[PDB]
Curated annotation (Swiss-Prot):
One of its GO terms (molecular function) is protein-disulfide reductase activity. Keywords: Disulfide bond, Electron transport, Redox-active center, Transport. GO terms for cellular component: cytosol. The keyword Glycoprotein does not apply. Pfam families: Thioredoxin. Disulfide bonds join 37-40. The keyword Transport applies. GO terms for biological process: cell redox homeostasis. This is Thioredoxin. Residues 2-113 form the Thioredoxin domain. CDD domains: TRX_family. It comes from the Bacteria.
């Protein structure tokens, strides 16, 4: 089953990346992913929880490399899944391959000192 409030993520494209990711004065986390990749499918529910839980500290976004390969090569992040953390529309940290909740919330507790 699914629902319109099951996630707090945003979806971005090569035509909208500047208006959402580079527009953000707060920290924003882009996951470059595709539905056809196993590790992408495995990190998606962990990022969905991170979007729902960490909304006050950061924003969580997805770039679909299957329909925006332009944005995938623009940052050289084609080696999916690939996570970029931006602050004030400028890149600050890079991560590649899947994470579990513990590893993802360590790398985001680096900006959320409250947990974990």
């Amino acid at each position: 089953m699914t629902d319109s409030e099951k996630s707090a993520t945003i979806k971005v494209t090569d035509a909208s990346f500047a208006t959402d990711v580079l527009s953000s004065n707060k920290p924003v986390l882009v996951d470059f992913w595709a539905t056809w990749c196993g590790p992408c499918k495995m990190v998606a529910p962990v990022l969905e929880e991170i979007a729902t839980e960490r909304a006050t500290d950061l924003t969580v976004a997805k770039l679909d490399v299957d329909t925006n390969p332009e944005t995938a090569r623009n940052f050289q992040v084609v080696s999916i899944p690939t996570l970029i953390l931006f602050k004030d529309g400028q890149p600050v940290k890079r991560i590649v391959g899947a994470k579990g909740k513990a590893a993802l919330l360590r790398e985001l507790s680096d900006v959320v000192p409250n947990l974990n």
